[PDB]
């Protein structure tokens, strides 16, 4: 149908806008602390602590499969990256501090993305 295609064009544009957002959020992590999944070889107990791991490369795979239906789902995953880190790592660690800075700096990007998603529809 013509509707399904129009629907698909919107998802492709949402995917387009979320890819730009992801790139901007990932620039806020120049140390690449959140780039890849926490290694289960190097942190074998990780899943005893963190039930839903997340990282930027895993978000990118979902993104490129057009697996985010709306900005809310995308934000859920970004928030997991941050909140998982802040639980597993103590306050006085480079990891916890990197998450705080990513949260704070990502807020600005995400604030405008919401306006752009509502605005463009």
From Swiss-Prot:
<comment type="subunit">
    <text>Component of some HBO1 complex composed of KAT7/HBO1, MEAF6, ING4 and BRD1/BRPF2. Component of the MOZ/MORF complex composed at least of ING5, KAT6A, KAT6B, MEAF6 and one of BRPF1, BRD1/BRPF2 and BRPF3. Interacts (via PHD-type zinc finger domain) with unmodified histone H3. Interacts (via PWWP domain) with dimethylated and trimethylated 'Lys-79' on histone H3.</text>
</comment>
<feature type="cross-link" description="Glycyl lysine isopeptide (Lys-Gly) (interchain with G-Cter in SUMO2)">
    <location>
        <position position="41"/>
    </location>
</feature>
<feature type="domain" description="Bromo">
    <location>
        <begin position="9"/>
        <end position="113"/>
    </location>
</feature>
<comment type="function">
    <text>Scaffold subunit of various histone acetyltransferase (HAT) complexes, such as the MOZ/MORF and HBO1 complexes, that acts as a regulator of hematopoiesis. Plays a key role in HBO1 complex by directing KAT7/HBO1 specificity towards histone H3 'Lys-14' acetylation (H3K14ac), thereby promoting erythroid differentiation.</text>
</comment>
<protein>
    <recommendedName>
        <fullName>Bromodomain-containing protein 1</fullName>
    </recommendedName>
</protein>
């Amino acid at each position: 149908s013509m509707e399904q295609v129009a629907m698909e064009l919107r998802l492709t544009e949402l995917t387009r806008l979320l890819r730009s957002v992801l790139d901007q959020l990932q620039d806020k992590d120049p140390a690449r602390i959140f780039a890849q999944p926490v290694s289960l070889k190097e942190v074998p107990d990780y899943l005893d602590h963190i039930k839903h791991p997340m990282d930027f490369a895993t978000m990118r795979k979902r993104l490129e499969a057009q697996g985010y239906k709306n900005l809310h789902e995308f934000e859920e995953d970004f928030d997991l990256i941050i909140d998982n880190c802040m639980k597993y790592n103590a306050r006085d660690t480079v990891f916890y501090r990197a998450a705080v800075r990513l949260r704070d700096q990502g807020g600005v990007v995400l604030r405008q993305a919401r306006r752009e998603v509502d605005s463009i529809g």
